[PDB]
Amino acid sequence: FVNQHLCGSHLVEALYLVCGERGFFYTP
Amino acid sequence: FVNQHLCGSHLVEALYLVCGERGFFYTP
Amino acid sequence: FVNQHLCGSHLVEALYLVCGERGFFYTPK
Amino acid sequence: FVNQHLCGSHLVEALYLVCGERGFFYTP
Amino acid sequence: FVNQHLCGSHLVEALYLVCGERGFFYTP
Amino acid sequence: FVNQHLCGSHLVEALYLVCGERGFFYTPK
Amino acid sequence: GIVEQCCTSICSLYQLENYCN
Amino acid sequence: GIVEQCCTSICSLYQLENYCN
Amino acid sequence: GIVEQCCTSICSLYQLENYCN
Amino acid sequence: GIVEQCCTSICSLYQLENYCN
Amino acid sequence: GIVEQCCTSICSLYQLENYCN
Amino acid sequence: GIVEQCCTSICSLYQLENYCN
Ligand SMILES: Oc1cccc(O)c1
Ligand SMILES: Oc1cccc(O)c1
Ligand SMILES: Oc1cccc(O)c1
Ligand SMILES: Oc1cccc(O)c1
Ligand SMILES: Oc1cccc(O)c1
Ligand SMILES: Oc1cccc(O)c1
Ligand SMILES: Oc1cccc(O)c1
Ligand SMILES: Oc1cccc(O)c1
Ligand SMILES: [Cl-]
Ligand SMILES: [Cl-]
Ligand SMILES: [Cl-]
Ligand SMILES: [Cl-]
Ligand SMILES: [Cl-]
Ligand SMILES: [Zn+2]
Ligand SMILES: [Zn+2]
């Protein structure tokens, strides 16, 4: 199962939304 | 405005995919 | 162009994340 | 779990698409 | 262009949901 | 859990992005 | 609710439509 | 094609089903 | 409604929260 | 990191804010 | 097929490209 | 930046790869 890959997909979307103009690093 | 917001949502999606275990830096 | 439809798709996702256990109502129209 | 959180994300998109003009309540 | 690119992302998810076990063929 | 369903949703978004102008054929099972 | 019905097993679009307003 | 049909104006789930296998 | 308020100018999370149950 | 922290148990949007820039 | 190949273990982008037209 | 480069014309995944860590 590709659980961690699917989770990350959603994490990045959530970060995009919450962080806004601040941006973010995604460092898995 | 909203068009840029929606574009960035998809940019983050594509970065997640192409960057893999490297991750990425998103800055608007 | 389907701009409002694409906007709606993203609004629904944002409401899902913001609202948590409260949930939300996406009104008709 | 995260499982259910991620499933919920997909459920809301499916309802968005199925319900179209009617809208919907999401009450988890 | 970008608009069509963003639209297509959503089109593919809608076809995924509509088509179920049938799958689908996508051409731009 | 609906594992394969949620996986498939992401598979098709990945195919969309990787395939670009070629498009793709999603034929599960 | 919808999570228990549709996260345990795949709900069809017809099944999901029951949740529309 | 599908882009010209469904990106200009909203396609119903019925119209989309046309592209299913 | 939400489309009118949030589909030209971006709604913040605070603004979106106004649409939670 | 974020995956250890948030793929195990759900992180709220407020929790995820710690990973912002 | 693709679900068997790519939902069990992560598929690379090259592996996914097999399913391009 | 990325928005400048990629929201006004399509960026391939190879172009996007410039923004990987
Ligand atoms: O990212 C954002 C969020 C809210 C308003 C805005 O102009 C930008
Ligand atoms: O960001 C992405 C893009 C494509 C598939 C996926 O699971 C995540
Ligand atoms: O049973 C489900 C769960 C998530 C999305 C969907 O379309 C159906
Ligand atoms: O016409 C469209 C375009 C994109 C998604 C969708 O559900 C319908
Ligand atoms: O104004 C908007 C439109 C779509 C998503 C979002 O987070 C904000
Ligand atoms: O803990 C998580 C994991 C993925 C998405 C999200 O919003 C929260
Ligand atoms: O193996 C997979 C499954 C889902 C998305 C992806 O990019 C790869
Ligand atoms: O140029 C772009 C804009 C948004 C997503 C993407 O994959 C490419
Ligand atoms: Cl994985
Ligand atoms: Cl529209
Ligand atoms: Cl969009
Ligand atoms: Cl499943
Ligand atoms: Cl998922
Ligand atoms: Zn979009
Ligand atoms: Zn998912």
Numbering used by the authors:
A (entry chain J), B (entry chain B), D (entry chain L), E (entry chain D): 1 to 28
C (entry chain F), F (entry chain H): 1 to 29
G (entry chain K), H (entry chain C), I (entry chain E), J (entry chain I), K (entry chain G), L (entry chain A): 1 to 21
Authors' own words:
The therapeutic hormone insulin is a small protein used daily in the medical treatment of diabetes by millions of people. In the presence of divalent ions like zinc, the monomers assemble into hexamers, where each of the two central zinc ions is coordinated by three histidine residues. In the hexameric form, chain B has been shown to exist in two allosteric states denoted T and R. The R state has two allosteric binding sites usually referred to as the phenolic binding site and HisB10 anion site.
Given the observed electron density, a chloride ion was fitted into this position. Five of these were located at equivalent positions in the monomers, Figure 6.
